[PDB]
Amino acid sequence: VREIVHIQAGQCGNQIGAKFWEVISDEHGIDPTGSYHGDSDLQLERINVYYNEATGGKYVPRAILVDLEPGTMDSVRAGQFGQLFRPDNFVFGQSGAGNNWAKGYYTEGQELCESILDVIRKEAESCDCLQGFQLVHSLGGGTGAGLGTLLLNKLREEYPDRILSTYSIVPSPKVSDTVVEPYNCTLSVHQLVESADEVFCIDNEALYDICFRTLKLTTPTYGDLNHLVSMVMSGTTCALRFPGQLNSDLRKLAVNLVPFPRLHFFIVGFAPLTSRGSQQYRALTVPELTSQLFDNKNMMAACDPRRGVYLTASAHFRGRMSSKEVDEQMLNIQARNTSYFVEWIPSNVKSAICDIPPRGLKMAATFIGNTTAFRELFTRVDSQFQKMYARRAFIHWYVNEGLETVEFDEARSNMTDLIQEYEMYET
Amino acid sequence: ELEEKIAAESLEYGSHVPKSLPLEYSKFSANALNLRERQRKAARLRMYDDADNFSKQALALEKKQLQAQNEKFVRAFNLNRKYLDKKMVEQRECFREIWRRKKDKVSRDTTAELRQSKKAIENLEKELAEAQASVAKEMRRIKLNERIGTAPVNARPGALY
Amino acid sequence: MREVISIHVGQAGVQIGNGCWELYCLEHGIQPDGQLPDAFNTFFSETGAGKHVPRAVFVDLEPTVVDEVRTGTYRQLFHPEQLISGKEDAANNYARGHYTVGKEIIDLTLDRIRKLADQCTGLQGFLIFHSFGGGTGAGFGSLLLERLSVDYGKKSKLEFTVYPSPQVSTAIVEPYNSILATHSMIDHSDCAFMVDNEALYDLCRRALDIERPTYTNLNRLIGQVVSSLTASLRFDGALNVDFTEFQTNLVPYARIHFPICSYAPVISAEKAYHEQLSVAEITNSLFEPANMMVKCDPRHGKYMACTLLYRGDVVPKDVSAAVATIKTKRTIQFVDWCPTGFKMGINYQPPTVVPGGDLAKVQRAVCMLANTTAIAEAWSRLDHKFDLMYAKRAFVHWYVGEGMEEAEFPEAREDLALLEKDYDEVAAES
Amino acid sequence: DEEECIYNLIPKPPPVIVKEPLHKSKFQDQKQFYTAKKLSHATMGLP
Amino acid sequence: MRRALRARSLTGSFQTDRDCDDIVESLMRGAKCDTIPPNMTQNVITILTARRKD
Ligand SMILES: Nc1nc2c(ncn2[C@@H]2O[C@H](COP(=O)(O)OP(=O)(O)OP(=O)(O)O)[C@@H](O)[C@H]2O)c(=O)[nH]1
Ligand SMILES: Nc1nc2c(ncn2[C@@H]2O[C@H](COP(=O)(O)OP(=O)(O)O)[C@@H](O)[C@H]2O)c(=O)[nH]1
Ligand SMILES: [Mg+2]
């Protein structure tokens, strides 16, 4: 009875969420038509976290779908698990996305926001309890980057106690999928820094590298990439759904990992990864999970932890294991590699254990880290923002929508201040 | 001192009330700018009598949504104020809680120190009463001996000198 | 006739309680549903037609751990009013579990324990379990003790708490939570015992031969001591020690009450085939630094008065011979005041085993509670860890945001300093 | 207690609450229990 | 408490706002639009847009 509201916004968020419901429905044992035919009584214990029950044994997820154009909605509507969603929860406009942050935030966002909030209010007030909100969006586009922040601000206005955890995808360092990303990302950061409580950053390039290096995928489609992201989102809330020897929910994670209000951007990872044909050679044990978790190549964000220093880190374990083994391993990784962990915080590594692992695996682990290495990512976008802005260039398409030039200067000022804040605490 | 800190906090919150509608709320929507663009391009042609119609159509739309955003701003300000108000109530709740405990510490230690002396006094007062009872009994026997009596047993002599 | 109340708070307390009540129910001969297939009534209350109910209260601000018992086998044993569950946990935050969310459930908790005490005609103490690093174990634990002090006054309140280990840690804000709970417990507790996971882990691997223990194995070890500690009130014995007797014998002052515990023999099945473990051997095994359940070396400091408890076919002369040999140890340092320095007890009931257990069926066993100055090592570690964080104000915003006033942080630091001062003053030369 | 001489002022010395430096415990040797051998970097190799 | 609810300048400083307010007031009294300094037009446009809305 710690329900979580899930919101999908934008092209990227909608597809990731679609795979995410397949992952849960398999774990809990729900048919695509919403019938329960599972295999364990434990799956029905706390299914209320993610689902509402319709009279007749039909289970409906707490999902809200948002887009400016119905293009991606129709693809999900034809999906395998498309029948699962509530038909009235589909909210969309009738205008092109525009790929413009100002247009999404100001021009079409205002019209859509009033309907979206009441759709949220139906699900938020329908359940016995509500811990926090779950948002999926990207930071390079116009719909997710703009309208997602607008809904985040409204959510912070109405519900100032709940945890506003969001999952975001950051533009890649080498080749990126939009011309005007530095404008969109810098504007989006200023909203996210103040309004949110947890932000998880995922990079597409690292997902490609992880697929080829470990999974040996010759042709990794977006389906596999969304599958990799879906595991982490399942892992974080698993402590709510199943019993364990040491429970650790969202607010425990926020207090442990966040030492100052603004340093709350996080890197994520998952282990183990089934190499096709090669895992026969590998002996999966708890120390092996730790080796993959703290390996720099498994991180989903292309920021090298070794070039920075750690502040806090957290690991979850799923399955029947020894508690002494877990507490010893966190000790060993912190003692053998001292230089990267700060001094003025002892016991930088948090741990947690849950007895029920996912299907097929015997044990699974999730790694969430916080480090100064994020200054690499913000420096990357700042230089792109700076030099384009000097030429003015694409500004013409944001000014006409009603955005004044002071917003660019304010967004850079806050974003640069965030960079220095990671600089200062390295001492 | 806590009351002074709360008063300073209250002053700080209300010091910076904007004199006009802030920037984020200040913008229009699509249906206003589109009508402005068609109005401006109509007047560029020698078709003024239709541009004037578009302007008068767009004015009544800007006038609506501007005051529509005004109510949202006022509601948001009031909701932010109510959050700060419940927080400072919680601050006072902690202060009365901590000093309730601080009062209990003294209220127990002082009563314990008195309780040591209270029983000691009551202990000796009972000892004195029982001691005086023997003296009164011997005096009563000696007084009654004044009119006929018999000799009693004597105490132990020669203890130590 | 003589009764004890058990309170379990947080994850660590209630998960220990599951193991303890398994040990008690099997020892007396009661099936888990509370029926029969004596000393029953010191831990249980009897209803008509032969159903027994324990004297226990299970409280945590989150329902997952408690609902395990509600769905488990023991659901038939407890009274549903006893099992109390909150809505959202304290998130390892002291201020959250004391002021904001702890006060929501406190008066509901206090009504039940007081209601449970009405049936207890001869109650003589309380048994309370904590983990100092947790938000509920410390924040709500400190709140619970403060009320019980004024609600019940002069009734001995004994605690069994998990102290933060030197090296092993699972919460980053753990040093913050321990110091704040340190102030409340030093004034209100009649006597508080100390245990830690790090020493119990090493004990559960060396003495008991286990490659990879879990929380379950450690919880059975603590139950043995509490069962041995309370065995004087339950079964017959040649020398009996009531709760007031440990209280006066162990402590010379009010603020020097903290003991440390030990137990012997802790042996595996295939080692006891060789080691006999008679009275002289088990008494010697107690004083080794290996068997201490808190990782603080007794050789670092000196010993004050100690208490020994024997379970089995033990004769008083063998006790006197063993204690005499211990006083011949020059590696053991005693304070020159208290030349006596010992109180011994003997009971005629062997320890109790558990199916799928870890211990051997030794026919005689000994338990030790001792007062020593070595615990000053344990606080100095906690003191240093706190100073590094508070110098840079590492996590203050979380605690301030939940109502806590910052002035409490130096005050709780100041109080721990006096406690460190007090122990060294007494430990100083006569 | 109505005397005029009392009226002028009631000064107080600096706070008798101890300005003393915080007590330093004697029990500071800790190599018994802080035991794990620290290394700069083994598992996470150099950049 | 949110930055949107908090007061903010329409330019780099309130002093620039006062200089802009002075020139806008001069414009209100019939001064032609070419009297504005070339670098100064941007702040004038932003404030005029804000004050029409007001
Ligand atoms: N011996 C033992 N210790 C445990 C067990 N479970 C948890 N712990 C200890 O409990 C300590 C921390 O307390 P928490 O787990 O946060 O429990 P809590 O007081 O309820 O805190 P919250 O759940 O956040 O309210 C950890 O250091 C663990 O070592 C257990 O089953 N056995
Ligand atoms: N992982 C993943 N990323 C995607 C997918 N589809 C799009 N993206 C990424 O999302 C980013 C921006 O998406 P965009 O179309 O602008 O979303 P918008 O905000 O709704 O406009 C691009 O850089 C894409 O790489 C997908 O199916 N999976
Ligand atoms: Mg708890």
Description:
Chain D: It is found in: Cell projection, Cilium; Cytoplasm, Cytoskeleton. Chain D: This is LOC402794 protein, putative. Chain A: This is Tubulin beta chain. Chain A is built from 15 helices and 12 strands. Chain A is of the alpha/beta class and about 425 residues long. Chain A is globular, with a radius of gyration of 21 Å. Chain A starts with a strand and ends with a helix. Chain B is mostly helical. Chain B has 3 helices and no strands. Chain B is about 80% helix and about 0% strand. Helix content of chain C is about 45%, strand content about 15%. Chain C has 15 helices and 12 strands. In chain C, strand 7 (about 155-160), helix 6 and strand 8 form a beta-alpha-beta unit. In chain C, helix 3 packs across helix 5 (about 135-150). The radius of gyration of chain C is 21 Å and the shape is globular. The chains are: A alpha/beta (about 425), B mainly alpha (about 160), C alpha/beta (about 425), D little secondary structure (about 45). Chains in contact: A-B, A-C, A-D, A-E, B-C, B-E, C-D. The interface of A and D includes residues 296, 304, 305, 335 and 336 of A. The complex binds guanosine-5'-triphosphate (GTP), guanosine-5'-diphosphate and magnesium ion. Guanosine-5'-triphosphate (GTP) binds next to helix 1, helix 5 and helix 8 of chain C.
Secondary structure layout:
The structure is cut from a larger assembly and holds 1 copy of chain A (427 residues), 2 copies of chain B, 1 copy of chain C (430 residues) and 1 copy of chain D (47 residues).
Chain A (H helix, E strand, L loop, with lengths): L3 E6 H19 L22 E4 L3 E4 L1 E5 L3 H7 L12 E3 L8 H7 L1 H16 L7 E7 L4 H16 L4 E8 L10 H15 L2 E6 H12 L6 H15 L1 H4 L8 H8 L7 E7 L14 H8 L16 E9 L4 H14 L12 E6 L9 E8 L3 H16 L5 H4 L6 H19 L3
Parallel strand pairs in A: 1-4, 1-6, 4-5, 6-7, 7-8, 8-9, 10-11
Antiparallel strand pairs in A: 2-3, 9-12, 10-12
Helix pairs in contact in A: 1-5, 1-8, 3-5, 4-5, 5-6, 6-13, 6-15, 13-15
Chain B lengths: L1 H12 L16 H15 L3 H98 L16
Chain D lengths: L47
The complex binds guanosine-5'-triphosphate, guanosine-5'-diphosphate (GDP) and magnesium ion (MG).
PDB class: structural protein
Keywords: doublet microtubule, tubulin, flagella, structural protein
Entry title: 48-nm doublet microtubule from Trichomonas vaginalis strain G3
